[PDB]
Design a protein around this motif. Sequence first.
Motif, PDB file in Angstrom:
ATOM      1  N   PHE A  34      46.505   7.668 -62.002  1.00  0.00           N
ATOM      2  CA  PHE A  34      46.133   7.637 -63.425  1.00  0.00           C
ATOM      3  C   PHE A  34      47.266   7.111 -64.336  1.00  0.00           C
ATOM      4  CE2 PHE A  34      43.149  11.391 -62.394  1.00  0.00           C
ATOM      5  CZ  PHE A  34      42.291  10.440 -61.813  1.00  0.00           C
ATOM      6  N   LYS A  35      48.508   7.421 -63.999  1.00  0.00           N
ATOM      7  CA  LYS A  35      49.581   6.919 -64.871  1.00  0.00           C
ATOM      8  C   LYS A  35      49.801   5.459 -64.564  1.00  0.00           C
ATOM      9  CE  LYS A  35      53.124   9.355 -65.014  1.00  0.00           C
ATOM     10  NZ  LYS A  35      54.160  10.401 -64.996  1.00  0.00           N
ATOM     11  N   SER A  36      49.829   5.045 -63.306  1.00  0.00           N
ATOM     12  CA  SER A  36      50.134   3.664 -62.976  1.00  0.00           C
ATOM     13  C   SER A  36      48.998   2.711 -63.340  1.00  0.00           C
ATOM     14  CB  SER A  36      50.470   3.362 -61.519  1.00  0.00           C
ATOM     15  OG  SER A  36      51.531   4.207 -61.067  1.00  0.00           O
ATOM     16  N   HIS A  37      47.798   3.238 -63.174  1.00  0.00           N
ATOM     17  CA  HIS A  37      46.561   2.479 -63.324  1.00  0.00           C
ATOM     18  C   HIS A  37      45.586   3.226 -64.171  1.00  0.00           C
ATOM     19  CE1 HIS A  37      48.105  -0.218 -60.142  1.00  0.00           C
ATOM     20  NE2 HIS A  37      48.499   0.894 -59.549  1.00  0.00           N
ATOM     21  N   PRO A  38      45.895   3.319 -65.463  1.00  0.00           N
ATOM     22  CA  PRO A  38      45.078   4.064 -66.453  1.00  0.00           C
ATOM     23  C   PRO A  38      43.611   3.835 -66.405  1.00  0.00           C
ATOM     24  CG  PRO A  38      47.265   3.666 -67.320  1.00  0.00           C
ATOM     25  CD  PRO A  38      47.170   2.812 -66.047  1.00  0.00           C
ATOM     26  N   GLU A  39      43.173   2.660 -66.042  1.00  0.00           N
ATOM     27  CA  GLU A  39      41.761   2.276 -65.937  1.00  0.00           C
ATOM     28  C   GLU A  39      40.978   3.045 -64.900  1.00  0.00           C
ATOM     29  OE1 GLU A  39      44.369   0.375 -65.127  1.00  0.00           O
ATOM     30  OE2 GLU A  39      44.064  -1.128 -63.530  1.00  0.00           O
ATOM     31  N   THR A  40      41.645   3.564 -63.895  1.00  0.00           N
ATOM     32  CA  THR A  40      40.956   4.298 -62.817  1.00  0.00           C
ATOM     33  C   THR A  40      40.401   5.595 -63.391  1.00  0.00           C
ATOM     34  OG1 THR A  40      43.087   5.162 -61.987  1.00  0.00           O
ATOM     35  CG2 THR A  40      42.381   3.199 -60.859  1.00  0.00           C
ATOM     36  N   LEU A  41      41.099   6.170 -64.366  1.00  0.00           N
ATOM     37  CA  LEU A  41      40.689   7.423 -65.031  1.00  0.00           C
ATOM     38  C   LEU A  41      39.313   7.323 -65.668  1.00  0.00           C
ATOM     39  CD1 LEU A  41      41.472  10.301 -65.713  1.00  0.00           C
ATOM     40  CD2 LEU A  41      42.786   9.462 -67.608  1.00  0.00           C
ATOM     41  N   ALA A  95      30.499   3.400 -53.224  1.00  0.00           N
ATOM     42  CA  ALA A  95      29.941   2.071 -53.600  1.00  0.00           C
ATOM     43  C   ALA A  95      28.677   2.188 -54.506  1.00  0.00           C
ATOM     44  CB  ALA A  95      29.575   1.266 -52.361  1.00  0.00           C
ATOM     45  N   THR A  96      27.829   3.154 -54.227  1.00  0.00           N
ATOM     46  CA  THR A  96      26.551   3.297 -54.945  1.00  0.00           C
ATOM     47  C   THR A  96      26.545   4.345 -55.990  1.00  0.00           C
ATOM     48  OG1 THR A  96      24.029   3.483 -54.568  1.00  0.00           O
ATOM     49  CG2 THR A  96      25.553   3.654 -52.550  1.00  0.00           C
ATOM     50  N   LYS A  97      27.330   5.401 -55.830  1.00  0.00           N
ATOM     51  CA  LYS A  97      27.323   6.428 -56.899  1.00  0.00           C
ATOM     52  C   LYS A  97      28.431   6.114 -57.892  1.00  0.00           C
ATOM     53  CE  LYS A  97      25.813   9.300 -59.542  1.00  0.00           C
ATOM     54  NZ  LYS A  97      25.890  10.784 -59.475  1.00  0.00           N
ATOM     55  N   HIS A  98      29.646   6.221 -57.413  1.00  0.00           N
ATOM     56  CA  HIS A  98      30.860   6.090 -58.236  1.00  0.00           C
ATOM     57  C   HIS A  98      31.180   4.653 -58.609  1.00  0.00           C
ATOM     58  CE1 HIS A  98      30.656  10.099 -56.694  1.00  0.00           C
ATOM     59  NE2 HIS A  98      31.367   9.884 -55.580  1.00  0.00           N
ATOM     60  N   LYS A  99      30.918   3.667 -57.764  1.00  0.00           N
ATOM     61  CA  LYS A  99      31.212   2.251 -57.979  1.00  0.00           C
ATOM     62  C   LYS A  99      32.714   1.986 -58.179  1.00  0.00           C
ATOM     63  CE  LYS A  99      26.697   2.753 -59.323  1.00  0.00           C
ATOM     64  NZ  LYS A  99      26.012   4.053 -59.722  1.00  0.00           N
ATOM     65  N   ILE A 100      33.405   2.222 -57.068  1.00  0.00           N
ATOM     66  CA  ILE A 100      34.827   2.091 -56.855  1.00  0.00           C
ATOM     67  C   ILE A 100      35.130   0.796 -56.102  1.00  0.00           C
ATOM     68  CG2 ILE A 100      36.982   3.252 -55.887  1.00  0.00           C
ATOM     69  CD1 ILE A 100      35.035   4.676 -58.297  1.00  0.00           C
ATOM     70  N   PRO A 101      35.709  -0.158 -56.794  1.00  0.00           N
ATOM     71  CA  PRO A 101      36.087  -1.424 -56.176  1.00  0.00           C
ATOM     72  C   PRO A 101      37.224  -1.177 -55.169  1.00  0.00           C
ATOM     73  CG  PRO A 101      36.823  -1.409 -58.449  1.00  0.00           C
ATOM     74  CD  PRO A 101      35.990  -0.159 -58.254  1.00  0.00           C
ATOM     75  N   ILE A 102      37.227  -2.014 -54.115  1.00  0.00           N
ATOM     76  CA  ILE A 102      38.270  -1.874 -53.082  1.00  0.00           C
ATOM     77  C   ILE A 102      39.626  -1.774 -53.737  1.00  0.00           C
ATOM     78  CG2 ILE A 102      39.403  -3.070 -51.082  1.00  0.00           C
ATOM     79  CD1 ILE A 102      36.773  -1.863 -50.349  1.00  0.00           C
ATOM     80  N   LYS A 103      39.845  -2.549 -54.762  1.00  0.00           N
ATOM     81  CA  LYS A 103      41.107  -2.641 -55.526  1.00  0.00           C
ATOM     82  C   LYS A 103      41.595  -1.257 -55.977  1.00  0.00           C
ATOM     83  CE  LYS A 103      43.706  -5.356 -58.020  1.00  0.00           C
ATOM     84  NZ  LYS A 103      45.193  -5.648 -57.873  1.00  0.00           N
ATOM     85  N   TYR A 104      40.666  -0.390 -56.394  1.00  0.00           N
ATOM     86  CA  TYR A 104      41.090   0.952 -56.773  1.00  0.00           C
ATOM     87  C   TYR A 104      41.503   1.747 -55.531  1.00  0.00           C
ATOM     88  CZ  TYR A 104      39.266   0.198 -61.490  1.00  0.00           C
ATOM     89  OH  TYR A 104      38.978  -0.449 -62.645  1.00  0.00           O
ATOM     90  N   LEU A 105      40.979   1.432 -54.369  1.00  0.00           N
ATOM     91  CA  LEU A 105      41.357   2.053 -53.100  1.00  0.00           C
ATOM     92  C   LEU A 105      42.776   1.680 -52.718  1.00  0.00           C
ATOM     93  CD1 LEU A 105      38.042   2.043 -51.045  1.00  0.00           C
ATOM     94  CD2 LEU A 105      39.135   3.834 -52.429  1.00  0.00           C
ATOM     95  N   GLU A 106      43.084   0.439 -53.050  1.00  0.00           N
ATOM     96  CA  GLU A 106      44.465  -0.031 -52.884  1.00  0.00           C
ATOM     97  C   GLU A 106      45.428   0.732 -53.785  1.00  0.00           C
ATOM     98  OE1 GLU A 106      44.474  -4.187 -53.155  1.00  0.00           O
ATOM     99  OE2 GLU A 106      43.061  -4.440 -51.470  1.00  0.00           O
ATOM    100  N   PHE A 107      45.026   0.928 -55.039  1.00  0.00           N
ATOM    101  CA  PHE A 107      45.832   1.669 -56.017  1.00  0.00           C
ATOM    102  C   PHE A 107      46.125   3.068 -55.487  1.00  0.00           C
ATOM    103  CE2 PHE A 107      44.025  -1.037 -59.816  1.00  0.00           C
ATOM    104  CZ  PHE A 107      44.790  -2.121 -59.429  1.00  0.00           C
ATOM    105  N   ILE A 108      45.118   3.813 -55.090  1.00  0.00           N
ATOM    106  CA  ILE A 108      45.418   5.155 -54.571  1.00  0.00           C
ATOM    107  C   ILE A 108      46.280   5.115 -53.309  1.00  0.00           C
ATOM    108  CG2 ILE A 108      43.328   5.462 -53.081  1.00  0.00           C
ATOM    109  CD1 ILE A 108      43.284   8.462 -54.313  1.00  0.00           C
ATOM    110  N   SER A 109      46.147   4.134 -52.451  1.00  0.00           N
ATOM    111  CA  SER A 109      46.920   4.081 -51.171  1.00  0.00           C
ATOM    112  C   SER A 109      48.402   4.025 -51.491  1.00  0.00           C
ATOM    113  CB  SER A 109      46.517   2.935 -50.258  1.00  0.00           C
ATOM    114  OG  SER A 109      45.114   2.876 -50.012  1.00  0.00           O
TER     115      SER A 109
END
Length: 154
Positions: A34-41, A95-109
Amino acid sequence: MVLSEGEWQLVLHVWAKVEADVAGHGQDILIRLFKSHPETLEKFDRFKHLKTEAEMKASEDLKKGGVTVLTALGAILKKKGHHEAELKPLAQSHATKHKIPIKYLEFISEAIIHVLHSRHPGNFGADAQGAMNKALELFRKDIAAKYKELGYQG
Ligand code: HEM
């Protein structure tokens, strides 16, 4: 791709330390994201209204959120690549409920690696970090394959 047992060992060894305090690692991680990537919030209807880190820190729903994420992930790593089953339900809601792009998966990793590096310097040298990165990339690569099958991005 395929991890060797030695890579699994490194992963599972740091993971054993994270599991001494799931809740706290859970918080550090989400707060890092959330701090690094405010948009994920914004994806988090239950968290979007948190303005500052202090607030993030005091939120009991966030702490619970983090334990859920870490417990789901933990359950996947301990599988050592045989995680088909575990992944299905997880890819479908993301993918169908939350709609989380792979890119946000990279951010959390990224945030996970950041936190294990601060908290377990002695258990997270170059090799161990190379091994977790590989484990997280295998995670993403498979989730991405499932996304594609479910009709999302790909
Ligand atoms: C290590 C990667 C991730 C793991 C293992 C994980 C796991 C989970 C699990 C187990 C849940 C609860 C049930 C479900 O809906 O499937 C959940 C919910 C959720 N996740 Fe994730 N997640 C990950 C990454 C992400 C990312 C990176 C985001 C956003 C940027 C996110 C957004 C959400 C949302 C919005 C929910 C619904 C929260 C609620 O209202 O209860 N997830 N996730």
